[PDB]
Amino acid sequence: NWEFARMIKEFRATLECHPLTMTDPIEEHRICVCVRKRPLNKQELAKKEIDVISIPSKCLLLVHEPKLKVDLTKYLENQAFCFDFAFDETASNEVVYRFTARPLVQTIFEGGKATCFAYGQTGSGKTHTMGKGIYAMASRDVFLLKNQPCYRKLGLEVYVTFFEIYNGKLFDLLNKKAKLRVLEDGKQQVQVVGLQEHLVNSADDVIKMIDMGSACRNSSRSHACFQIILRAKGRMHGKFSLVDLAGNEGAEINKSLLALKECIRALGQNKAHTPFRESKLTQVLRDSFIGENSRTCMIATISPGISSCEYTLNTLRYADRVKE
Ligand SMILES: Nc1ncnc2c1ncn2[C@@H]1O[C@H](COP(=O)(O)OP(=O)(O)O)[C@@H](O)[C@H]1O
Ligand SMILES: [Mg+2]
Numbered sequence: 001n002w003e004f005a006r007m008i009k010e011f012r013a014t015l016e017c018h019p020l021t022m023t024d025p026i027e028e029h030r031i032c033v034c035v036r037k038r039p040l041n042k043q044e045l046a047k048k049e050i051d052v053i054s055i056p057s058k059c060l061l062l063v064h065e066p067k068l069k070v071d072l073t074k075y076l077e078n079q080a081f082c083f084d085f086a087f088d089e090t091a092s093n094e095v096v097y098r099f100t101a102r103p104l105v106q107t108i109f110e111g112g113k114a115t116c117f118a119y120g121q122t123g124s125g126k127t128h129t130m131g132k133g134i135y136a137m138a139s140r141d142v143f144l145l146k147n148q149p150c151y152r153k154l155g156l157e158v159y160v161t162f163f164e165i166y167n168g169k170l171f172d173l174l175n176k177k178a179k180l181r182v183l184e185d186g187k188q189q190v191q192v193v194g195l196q197e198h199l200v201n202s203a204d205d206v207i208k209m210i211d212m213g214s215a216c217r218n219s220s221r222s223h224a225c226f227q228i229i230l231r232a233k234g235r236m237h238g239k240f241s242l243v244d245l246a247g248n249e250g251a252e253i254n255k256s257l258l259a260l261k262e263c264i265r266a267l268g269q270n271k272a273h274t275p276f277r278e279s280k281l282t283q284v285l286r287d288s289f290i291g292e293n294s295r296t297c298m299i300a301t302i303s304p305g306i307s308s309c310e311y312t313l314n315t316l317r318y319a320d321r322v323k324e
Contacts, residue, residue: 001306003074004066005050011064011078012054019088020058022095026103031268031323032084032297034100035061035316037304038125039089049305053312055088061302063316065309081316084323089304096129097137100297101242105141108230108238109151112293115241115285117260119319121311122220122247124301130244131214135226138240139206142228156237159197159229160206162213166222167252168280173213173224174198182283190276190286197229220247223256223281241285248318249311256281257318263289264296264322298322 037053052064065077085099104114116134118126127133139160146156162173163180171177172195180194200206210226217224224244230237245260246253259279266274267289276286288294300319302312 001048001050001066004064004076004306007074007076008050008052008064011076015054015056017054017056018058019055020085020091020095020099022098024058024099026099027084028103029084029297030270030295031264032100032295033300033319033323034085034087034096034297035081035083035300035302035319036087036091036096036125036129037061037089037302038128040304044305049307051304052306052309053302053304055086057086059083059086061086061316063309063313065313066306079313079316081320083300083319093129093133094137096299097134100299101134101138101240102141104240104295104297105138105145107293107295108142108228108240109145110293111238112295113239113288113291114294115243115288115296117243117245117296117298118301119245119248119257119298120301120315121249121303121308124247124303124315126244126247126299126301127219129299129301130224130226130242131210133210135210135242136203136207138242139200139228140203142230142240143203146230154232154237157231158200159231160200160209161195161197161227161229162209162225163192163195164217164219164222164224165256165280165284170195170280170284171216172196173216174209177216182280184277184283188273188276188286190283192284221253222246225281225284239288241288243281248315255279261318261322264298265324267294267296268323 054062063079101116107114170180228240256279263274274289276282
């Protein structure tokens, strides 16, 4: 694809770039939508994959889409997408976390609900981002916040869960992949019956849990959900749910992802009710899509190679419609 690479180089040599750094200020969003470009791996560089993604600013991602005219003239359809944050291949997990999940950790101490989702094709970087990862960094900061004088008063304990969702069925990853069941009552309250919450006193305990759990969980065909639950005297104070979604590149997965978008869209419009029932994922998280102090972030992970271009565009089109 020598000519497409040449055109991409000419575009990049003229593009003056000012991407995100950590001295950009943390932003407080109800709905935060971001994109994360991973680097080409050694195998992609070996197969001579072209990088078709540029990030000229904090908010802007460009796709250099290779196109053919009817007369077989090669050109680039350079497509732009605008997000709350765009993270390039130099952004570490710590930098991503700062602008996404980290500002939502306080939310659960104010008695709110927080969610964080990684979304994109298999091989994009969802598990790398969540599972070092955002689960561990959130857990760390939860234990720093609850040792502070303000919140050390409240008598808070920290509990955790870790489950996967495959083909509309929930499996407990901390209790031997037991097939739990999700039930809803007349007041639209949802409970995952048989899901045990595990008490934890340190972030090191949680990392042992995530490692225990990850060993259990193709994991590209399932959702994995790790929850941090704050309880005040056994009474729930706050909850953070963090989800490594199934790869979006079949019919169960697609309806699940579509369901999630609609629930996030409803949260965005501060609606009293959302269409939570349309997948198991959204049913289990129903509580996180409603309320005054409910907040969410989604990280759309992308593979930058020319051969993934159509999957990249699908991911970006979806992420584009998550926040209005
Ligand atoms: N930002 C990144 N920097 C370096 N390597 C990455 C990055 N994102 C993903 N990878 C690596 O690429 C491979 C695929 O990532 P993974 O997290 O398993 O993808 P997914 O969960 O979306 O299928 C892994 O070996 C992973 O560690
Ligand atoms: Mg994965």
